[PDB]
Design a protein around this ligand. Sequence first.
Ligand SMILES: Nc1nc2c(ncn2[C@@H]2O[C@H](COP(=O)(O)OP(=O)(O)OP(=O)(O)O)[C@@H](O)[C@H]2O)c(=O)[nH]1
Ligand SMILES: Nc1ncnc2c1ncn2[C@@H]1O[C@H](COP(=O)(O)OP(=O)(O)CP(=O)(O)O)[C@@H](O)[C@H]1O
Ligand SMILES: COc1cc(C(=O)c2c[nH]c(-c3c[nH]c4ccccc34)n2)cc2c1OC=CO2
Ligand SMILES: Nc1nc2c(ncn2[C@@H]2O[C@H](COP(=O)(O)OP(=O)(O)O)[C@@H](O)[C@H]2O)c(=O)[nH]1
Ligand SMILES: [Ca+2]
Ligand SMILES: [Mg+2]
Ligand SMILES: [Mg+2]
Lengths: 427, 437, 332, 54
Amino acid sequence: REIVHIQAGQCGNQIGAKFWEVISDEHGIDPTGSYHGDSDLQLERINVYYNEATGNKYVPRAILVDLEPGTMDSVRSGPFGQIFRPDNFVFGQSGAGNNWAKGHYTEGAELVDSVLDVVRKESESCDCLQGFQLTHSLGGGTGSGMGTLLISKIREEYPDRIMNTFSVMPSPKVSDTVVEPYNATLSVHQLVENTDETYCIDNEALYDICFRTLKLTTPTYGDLNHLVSATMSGVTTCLRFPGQLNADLRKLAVNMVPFPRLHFFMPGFAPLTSRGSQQYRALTVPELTQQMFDSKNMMAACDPRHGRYLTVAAIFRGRMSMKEVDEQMLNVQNKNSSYFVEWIPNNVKTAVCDIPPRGLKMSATFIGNSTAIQELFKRISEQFTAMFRRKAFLHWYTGEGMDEMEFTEAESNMNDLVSEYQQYQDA
Amino acid sequence: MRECISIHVGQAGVQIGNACWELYCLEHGIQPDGQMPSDKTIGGGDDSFNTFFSETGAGKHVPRAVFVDLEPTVIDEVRTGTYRQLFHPEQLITGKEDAANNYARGHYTIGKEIIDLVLDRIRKLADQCTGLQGFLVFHSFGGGTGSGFTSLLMERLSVDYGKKSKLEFSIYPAPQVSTAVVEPYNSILTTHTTLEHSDCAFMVDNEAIYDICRRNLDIERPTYTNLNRLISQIVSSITASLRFDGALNVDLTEFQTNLVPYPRIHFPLATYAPVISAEKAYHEQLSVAEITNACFEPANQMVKCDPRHGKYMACCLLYRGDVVPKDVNAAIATIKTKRSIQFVDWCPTGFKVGINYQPPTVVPGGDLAKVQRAVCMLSNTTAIAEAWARLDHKFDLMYAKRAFVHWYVGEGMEEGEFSEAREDMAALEKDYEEVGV
Amino acid sequence: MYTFVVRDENSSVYAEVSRLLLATGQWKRLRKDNPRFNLMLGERNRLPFGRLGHEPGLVQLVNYYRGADKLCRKASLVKLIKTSPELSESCTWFPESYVIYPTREVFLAAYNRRREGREGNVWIALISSEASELLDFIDEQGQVHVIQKYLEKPLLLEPGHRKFDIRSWVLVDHLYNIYLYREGVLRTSSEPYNSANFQDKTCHLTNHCIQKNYGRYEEGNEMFFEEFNQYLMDALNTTLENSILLQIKHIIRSCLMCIEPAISTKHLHYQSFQLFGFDFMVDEELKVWLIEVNGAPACAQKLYAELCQGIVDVAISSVFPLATSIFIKLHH
Amino acid sequence: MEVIELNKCTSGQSFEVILKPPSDPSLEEIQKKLEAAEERRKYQEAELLKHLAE
Ligand SMILES: Nc1nc2c(ncn2[C@@H]2O[C@H](COP(=O)(O)OP(=O)(O)OP(=O)(O)O)[C@@H](O)[C@H]2O)c(=O)[nH]1
Ligand SMILES: Nc1ncnc2c1ncn2[C@@H]1O[C@H](COP(=O)(O)OP(=O)(O)CP(=O)(O)O)[C@@H](O)[C@H]1O
Ligand SMILES: COc1cc(C(=O)c2c[nH]c(-c3c[nH]c4ccccc34)n2)cc2c1OC=CO2
Ligand SMILES: Nc1nc2c(ncn2[C@@H]2O[C@H](COP(=O)(O)OP(=O)(O)O)[C@@H](O)[C@H]2O)c(=O)[nH]1
Ligand SMILES: [Ca+2]
Ligand SMILES: [Mg+2]
Ligand SMILES: [Mg+2]
């Protein structure tokens, strides 16, 4: 059950690069592509993300995409850059200019088919293809505009596979351009229709965690991406390692998504850690459980207590008492049963993995389908109208052929998304 | 002699089948390579164990079994396991993609593409049978394959083998070992579709087995292997009369005769005692009266329910070990005074007893201790409908919002089959009430 | 924190039981159909006992005993006493009773016995002296009815020549301990009893509700145990303990010990307690008779505080602990 | 308590004790429903591909 990885744009390639760094280290694959690992648990499900090359070398099933050569050259220069398959670098030269229209309709349109060719060559090699995961942001042009254009084309060719995305939402606390609410609103409209599961990695949450909890006075993208890679490793453990659940992307959608449009998850991690510095006290299973459900550990700036949980998935990594994990997880639901919908019985699932991530003896990753995620969409929606009611900065988009009416339709579709999440918060 | 074909569907059915066939082999003296030194009729025979095993010219004894899972991981361990020589490769059928916990995907989408192949491998076993009795179908309620494909297969078998009995060993969903949030949907869907095609069904509620493992086997978190070795013990007790010489329950038809007076109410409750741990260094061996009494303790039942607030329609005691009828009648006499055992007015208040002198067999390195005597009671009591109420309520909570229903419609199913399946369930619960009041 | 849910809003008793529990700060009330409760204060009819005891990690308790209806329904009560060897046909504290459905099993044979000596032949359902008067009154309704010997010579308090009934409140906990509330109540008829006119059934029926004279000799036609003990002393030279309460403790013990094997939750996956109200009648020879067992009982206003608090300590906090006794344990 | 129909053998015995006396669809039909579903599937997929075509 192979997964095909796609990272698009500056943000997609940067967090995408760290993901392959992180999980390569967990599976004991070095930059040369060779396995130098202790446990056979590291190789049992290694084919989910890696192609096995002659000489018994491992190649990530990854496609590196961008409309500009800058960041992709950075990836190749980087520590694990040589692990990638050189033919899977698909890039243009013009750049998207933080413009969704450029990524979706004009500059990206020229490059889309070449990417699909590399995607296709990786799919035909797959014994049984689960689907795809895309890393990108929604505030730029390439990851936002071209990524969603890629997602639409992949669904056309693989209508019966899972589409998974790691989508970085924009925040003024960490913003490159005023037009990010436009890029995000246009992308969400697409994600609502063409993705089965998308993890909402909110840059606002990453900032606040770095500023408040990690006491980082001035946080870089590397400090944010340290959180993102920790989350991406955690929400991938059930796929990469053997377990009782025998987890895959389709079963995750079945259990997490009661209604097809409500497929935007609140990720969470515990314990929160700043790069480099390692603390020496392992947590207690009770500590993991409360931090992971704590609003301060959520990677999307939403208040779980302003909503209700439709479904929850928790994964514990480390050597610990599964009996204690059971009790503790059971304790939090019974303690706070008001924040879980009553009409989906047994909507919290817990999995365990023996191997912990680098640097921690025990950790917990949290995946939540909370109706509180509407707060995220409300925030982006408010930033959008503030400019849109004055038509400000629209000329960057209309110059590439877009129409005002497309913005109105995207604005409206997202507002419906918020109404629908509200519907089940009162149900 | 009349052959019985076992069909193991899905992970739960396959892994539970492994436990059973491993236990059948130890009980009959069949080693993992298929040889049975005790069998002096080489290459064939019409002995009681030949109901479940066929013989080759080379003297190997092969299970009259087919294993079918829509995914290869589980049946592949059967291909490389300790009993890999036991099964012919055509007995194990696999696909590449499972049903994703989706009844509709197992029944309609993926099931439609593998049904003809399975029926043909089933036909290959049926062609070795001088007088085929029927089928024993092992599956789960909660799995997409175990629910969706099983009902598909149950319908076809009624078509192709209309004169042969079909018995079920169904695993009823429990959150302590749950694998999907839609398991209530799959249970109701497959029960509704299978109900008329099953002659008798033994439900094992994972909650009950799990707790029995924790309480009586002192296991903090029981594994599937822990549950399955205990389950195979119960299954072996139920099937022993088919594989051993006896006067009671010698054909699948006898199960319907003795346990099922009305066709739809065909879910007998199974209670098993004693479950004693191998780790206990000092054990006191329980008497015939102590183990018979334990059969009326809800903690020893495969489903948790209160038989005191229901009515019996049949009741069998299947003893294994040092038991003689005098002790059984004495235990029944004292128990009848102290217990709330009410029968329906149109059935006699009586027990049908079977005794096999060979005491229960245990797998070496298992968690179950060896006992001098044991019993499995099979009683058809309306109290089992408590399980239907629990399951139907959860179905009602989700279906009220049509949560997850889109996954089913997306495989070609119609919303109407949900309400139709739940109407049948509502009727089932009412039929149990009429009998039980 | 423990959790509980309420599913009977007309429970005066457990209305209090919620308030006292929330006030402990250690109990939180979920909504009706939240399955993840520790305690269920459940409905009166069709309570879903089959659903209790299947929530992993949750010890569930409930304030009703499944199967206790057998004792708390007049039709079943008579069938229970007749058919249980523990009680037997030769039962000396339950008036003659026969169940007659509307469309005479052996009821005729008993009424004809009384024409042999013209003994008192007053029955009840309602009160009549001719069988035809009563029998033609149960078919006029359409449901099951039971007729029982009317205690023609009951005990009357003077001044007033008045009729009463004693209601005792009994609590049975998850251990099947039987707790008898030390405070009882006499529901008194303010009307002077007289056997000439049954159909003026206001001095004959002692229901607090039916006495729509309300408050003459005692408030709310309710006399408490201290008052009734003093009277018995001053009037009859005896006590409530010796002349009455022994027999009540005997009946309460006998009725609940009879049905224990059928309702006990000792080895069950959920647990039961239940408050009962036993209603007794005392004849002129200081003999106590059992009239009805009430599975859904209502307390007297003066005692809600004390009893509902005893319910928490004995039946609830015994299973969900927190950070002399008002009951009398009837031993078995 | 009457014991009845006691049968014995080297493997064991069996008997009955009485405390008290009393007081399918065709193959083509399966083929229709199976194929009706696959069509409802193809219809919904075609609608998807038409919408993508727009
Ligand atoms: N007792 C017992 N229960 C099992 C076992 N395996 C799975 N289950 C239960 O079966 C239910 C899920 O059914 P599965 O057998 O896993 O489903 P499946 O037939 O493989 O179907 P799909 O995987 O969805 O295609 C859950 O309730 C599990 O608890 C087992 O080996 N023993
Ligand atoms: N055999 C009998 N002889 C004389 N009086 C009797 C009697 N049985 C009952 N009574 C009296 O008449 C009334 C009979 O009605 P009944 O006992 O059914 O009312 P009730 O008990 O249903 C009200 P609640 O349920 O609230 O206690 C009793 O209150 C009692 O005072
Ligand atoms: C738990 O975490 C994961 C599970 C699965 C999975 O396949 C899978 C299979 N049954 C379930 C499941 C059953 N009842 C639930 C109630 C709520 C949520 C999930 C479930 N979930 C897959 C994952 C995963 O976490 C990260 C990546 O993929
Ligand atoms: N968390 C995180 N966010 C990023 C990173 N790089 C860019 N972003 C965000 O992505 C948006 C800009 O998108 P970008 O990927 O650079 O544009 P693109 O290359 O045209 O797709 C802004 O909201 C940035 O805050 C990164 O490395 N980490
Ligand atoms: Ca032979
Ligand atoms: Mg940028
Ligand atoms: Mg499977």
